[PDB]
């Protein structure tokens, strides 16, 4: 039905320190050769309440993509802590992977991410200002939230 079918996304290097780059091994199948490019993005949700704090970590144009199976590791630098509101830094946030074809988003894969301290004192008495050098990022990889939108593939 859809020219591009995403078969699987594997979260690599997880858990890891907050500052480590994100690494996702994506596998997708192309039913027919694609005339245009696929644009992949990784978006970090800095704040659940405000859109302005979403950070596009990386965007990649892959194309043209011939028919068959494609597998690639999408890597993106960790978010800029200078744009993460303090109240949202520690605890659960979301990381999204999106793909568009001809500007139309056809898949959105989201993971809940748990940012937490690893030292007992910090876990019991967290600092007023979040210490990103002491946070451990744990992408909850066992439960991805997926949405597939039916777009125009011509």
């Amino acid at each position: 039905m859809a020219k591009v079918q995403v078969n699987n996304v594997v979260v690599l290097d997880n858990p890891s320190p907050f500052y480590n780059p994100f690494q996702f091994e994506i596998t997708f199948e192309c039913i027919e050769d694609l005339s245009e490019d696929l644009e992949w993005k990784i978006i970090y949700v800095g704040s659940a309440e405000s859109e302005e704090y979403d950070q596009v970590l990386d965007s990649v144009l892959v194309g043209p993509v011939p028919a068959g199976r494609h597998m690639f590791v999408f890597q993106a630098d960790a978010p800029n802590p200078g744009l993460i509101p303090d109240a949202d830094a520690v605890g659960v946030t979301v990381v999204l992977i999106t793909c568009t074809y001809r500007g139309q988003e056809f898949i959105r894969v989201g993971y809940y991410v748990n940012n937490e301290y690893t030292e007992t004192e910090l876990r019991e008495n967290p600092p007023v200002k979040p210490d990103f050098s002491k946070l451990q990022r744990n992408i909850l990889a066992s439960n991805p939230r997926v949405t597939r939108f039916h777009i125009n593939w011509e």
């Binding site: 659940a48 309440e49 979301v94 999204l96 988003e105 959105r108 939230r145 997926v146 949405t147 939108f149």
Partner: peptide, 10 residues
């Protein structure tokens, strides 16, 4: 309902 904003991602 903290993630009600993200309801275009289950």
């Amino acid at each position: 309902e903290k993630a009600a904003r993200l309801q275009x991602x289950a």
